[PDB]
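Reopening: structure tokens for the adenosine-5'-triphosphate complex, inputs below.
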Amino acid sequence: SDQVPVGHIPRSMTIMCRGEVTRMAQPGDHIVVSGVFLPLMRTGFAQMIQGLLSETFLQAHRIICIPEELEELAQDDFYERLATSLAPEIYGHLDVKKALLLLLVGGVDKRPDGMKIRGNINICLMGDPGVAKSQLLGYISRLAVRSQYTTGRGSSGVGLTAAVMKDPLTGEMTLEGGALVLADQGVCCIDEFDKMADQDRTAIHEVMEQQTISIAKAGIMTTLNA
Amino acid sequence: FPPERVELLQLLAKKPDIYDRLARAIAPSIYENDDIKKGILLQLFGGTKKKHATLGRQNFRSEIHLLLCGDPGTSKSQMLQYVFNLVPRSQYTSGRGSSAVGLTAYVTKDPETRQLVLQTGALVLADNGVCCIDEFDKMNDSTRSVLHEVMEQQTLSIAKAGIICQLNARTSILAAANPAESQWNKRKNIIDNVQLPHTLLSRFDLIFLVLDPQDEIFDKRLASHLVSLYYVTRHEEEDTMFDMSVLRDYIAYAREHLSPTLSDEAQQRLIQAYVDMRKVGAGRGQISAYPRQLESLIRLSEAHAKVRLSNQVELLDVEEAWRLHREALKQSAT
Amino acid sequence: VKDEVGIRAQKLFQDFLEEFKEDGEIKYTRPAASLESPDRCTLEVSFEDVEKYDQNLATAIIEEYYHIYPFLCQSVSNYVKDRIGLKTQKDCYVAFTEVPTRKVRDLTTSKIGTLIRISGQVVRTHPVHPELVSGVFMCLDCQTEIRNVEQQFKFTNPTICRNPVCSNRKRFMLDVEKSLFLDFQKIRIQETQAELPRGCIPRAVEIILRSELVETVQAGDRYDFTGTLIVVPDYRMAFLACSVQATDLPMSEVTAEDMKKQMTDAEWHKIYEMSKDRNLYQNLISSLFPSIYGNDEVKRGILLQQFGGVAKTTTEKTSLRGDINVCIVGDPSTAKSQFLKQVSDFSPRAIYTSGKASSAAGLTAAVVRDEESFDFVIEAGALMLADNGICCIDEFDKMDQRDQVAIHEAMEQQTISIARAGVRATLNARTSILAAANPINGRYDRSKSLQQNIQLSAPIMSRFDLFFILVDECNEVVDYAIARKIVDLHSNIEESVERAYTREEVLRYVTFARQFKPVISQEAGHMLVENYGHLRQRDTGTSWRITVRQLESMIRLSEAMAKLECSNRVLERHVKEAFRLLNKSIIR
DNA sequence: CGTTTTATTTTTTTTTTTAAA
Ligand SMILES: Nc1ncnc2c1ncn2[C@@H]1O[C@H](COP(=O)(O)OP(=O)(O)OP(=O)(O)O)[C@@H](O)[C@H]1O
Ligand SMILES: Nc1ncnc2c1ncn2[C@@H]1O[C@H](COP(=O)(O)OP(=O)(O)OP(=O)(O)O)[C@@H](O)[C@H]1O
Ligand SMILES: Nc1ncnc2c1ncn2[C@@H]1O[C@H](COP(=O)(O)OP(=O)(O)OP(=O)(O)O)[C@@H](O)[C@H]1O
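Re-run output (same inputs, fresh job):
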């Protein structure tokens, strides 16, 4: 989606990796593959084929996706310099950044009474100055591995979470969870949550109590581990 | 079932500490308004029916349901999660995440020839189990008004163009009701607060309050206790003995071969005190009782008789109602 | 042959049915005598017979049923030939009964060939769709006569040869016309309501039946089926049966006396004490809901709803009708649904069901788009199963703005056509209805019009002729009758009011009144003009929308109350009491 | 030692969803 010219629409290919290399990538990993282009002798009917149809496909080798540091980590012993080299693009307003870098930090959790405790920090933000919330959002979403982004109306309540679909040509439909569903071990960053919708606060509020996305929609009380 | 350990079965019934002792067990770490663990008193030594073997009429089921009202992020999920993490019939729910009509088994497209079947409903598979519901004044009018009957009727008339019947299912209910507002607005008796009338807001026996003590006093306690739940690195086996399983079996015996009756003793109280129950009805912006909660009282009668050893009715039990009720029912000052 | 065991069970079969069976005489020849018209072939025999004389050799019979049933069908024919002027044209139909024995859960592979008894409901059904089951043909060559059994699902037109070695794929087309074939139907049926489990649903199962059993089934009944489970030679499962056991001969409070028919209402001798002594009405106010208390007007009024209406002898230009539109409201926590639920026990087609759930397609069927059977079967439904019945419903409140499309039809049109991708016909509403709305905060605050106290749709309150509300008050001595009645509500000894009129004698006497058809040249019937006039003197004050659609009530309520006397020839007094509570209807 | 193989499209009713002064 960074190459596709002004007058173009992205398209997909198929991946068939067999044998050992299975289970070697998740959805939405930006990955680079070295393999072969190979056509596909789709034999069967003698008139729907028989064109020399050649519906090609790909063969696999690898899924590369664009302590070792310990001696150099010995070279440096400092706490504050992260703010000094994280997001240089604005001078000052360190306090917001250090507040973020805490969420980058983590490390608070316990399972007493059998029950868990939310060990994730969730900041709220009001303001319209020129802040470049868009700046820090892009910065974090790039450096924070396993990142996400949504906007003020791009994802209604079903999209950011799981949802449902309709088609009388492929079978039944599933949940196909959204960015908020997918962003575990990380952050999904909404921009202008104030302006999305009032009832939209509901399902997100459900995930306030973490890892609980209840759905009595596909005949379940499913969880999804938000 | 085990005949071996009969000793302690009788031992725990005749011990008046039932009020709190097992209730003290349930929240393992939390005192969180432990008049709510006495509200957990409501709940187990299992729940007898006045089924109607004599006349056969009317199907008077002894159902139980209460809610845990909101306006503060209190443990109105955590208990419900403690339960669902313990009871197998385990589900968690809330408004705006799912449909009101999840009793459907949808035929979006099927592996059939459009022999449209609605195989099994979801929210009703809790056969005497529980579905936890949260954030209750969240949904539209159709949602949460549609259920105005199943609560004490357990029927679901499937009167659609498809296949038809009158089915059965009955279970337990609890949620985290919320008014239109975050905080209960002061100066203002409770019937004004939730947007339900003095028939539907004043419906149950009691739908129980959850406030903050307006001072630091209560605040630091469970902090001081359970700040160090990370840092305690141990658990104290006190005289409130953490019953590993010695609790979990007696309740299973609690329903088997003695059978609570109701004779002539413990019923004249609110036979007579229905005077006191209803004559507070002369008033608007105040509230009295209505004649489904007296049913909830005769249902309250069932539990305490066998345990404490008179399966015929004793009279004190109704006090538990007043111990419960007027805690927010004669709190009707104006 | 092994199955000669069952042929000897078939010897056994003959041995008692031709011999002395019961009553000093035959049981199974009047069937035989009757079958001769089309060669009807349908005959019922008791299964207790295989206990009376076979001496519990049912287990020599009851296993090999589809195995040896054919042979039992052979026995039927061998019976008939022994005395009837006969040629072997006689076919098969055997429809066993008398099996003290009664389910879906008690089913396996293992259950083939038995005669268990099961009951279900009527839904989701299919029509006559015959089968030219037998027939003749041969191979390419010559042998053109085959009276064989081509009926097993593995049947095929081309055969190999008869006299000489012929082809093996060739076929003739042959005598499908001077021969004997069958006819049958097919449905879906769901688990009974006498049996009802937790969790599970009355799942659906599917079955066929014979000519004399065919099209003799109606809405929700309790019959005794036959347990001949059979395979699909696709597999998947099916089942089959051959015997059913779903008011000239009298109802309860009798023994045989004479009437217009055999014992249709014969027991006047005992009815009539409870027919005329007009305080019997108080039994019908008191001895019918002794476990219940409310207003005493409903408990003196519903009965004529249950009982037939007008059914007069007049025009073709327009219909006249008997029953009435009806309602009941109040607010809950007043015991306003006990009664409806009880009717399902009290009265026939007292289909207590919710209205909250139903669709506008609740009533008829909606669609089919594949060859289910014929690609257009949209004549299934929910209402017209009222076989001389009523459909009272709960939760008429949040209901949609389409149901009225049927209720508009209620007391004038009563006809049933659909604007779908199928066809249009019509049907006869046999039915009245009940109303089940409710108010917002309940109390119908007496400062605004009762129409406006709910303010629902336009014509609804034109058609519904009586509403009969019970509204709440706070005078607790009212309330202290109740619990002091429920003093005997659990205390199991005579825990209600002493009765004076059993349910079954009530239910029987309902009929005696419905075959009298009064005749009204009543001069007081001519002075209804004065009744209605002084009524409208009361209507003049308190100034609802009133007309002759309410006069219809003025007519029917009193005339059908003269029916309720089990009487022709209307009596004026019925009008005045009818006047009385109805003089409340404007003041209501 | 010879003589033959193989395709379907639009509308319903439910449960989803979505619109204007
Ligand atoms: N002190 C600063 N440091 C870095 N960038 C700045 C600074 N001041 C202004 N800018 C630039 O000005 C631009 C302001 O537009 P910007 O993207 O900030 O909108 P925004 O402030 O995010 O809008 P809103 O806050 O209403 O969502 C930013 O992209 C940012 O790069
Ligand atoms: N005395 C107490 N002991 C233990 N936990 C408490 C106490 N008081 C409050 N809490 C905590 O407060 C939290 C309240 O939020 P929870 O997620 O249940 O909110 P909620 O009940 O859904 O809120 P609302 O009903 O207002 O939407 C609980 O997780 C609980 O751990
Ligand atoms: N006159 C009476 N006779 C018998 N029972 C009464 C009478 N008055 C009050 N009651 C009792 O009061 C209770 C009222 O609550 P109830 O279960 O009737 O709600 P409901 O009327 O079914 O609500 P809805 O009709 O809206 O569904 C009844 O169970 C009933 O037994």
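The pocket of adenosine-5'-triphosphate (ligand 1) is lined by residues A 89-91, 127-135 (CB under 6 Å). The two ends of chain C are 83 Å apart (CA to CA). Marking as resolved unless the reporter disagrees.
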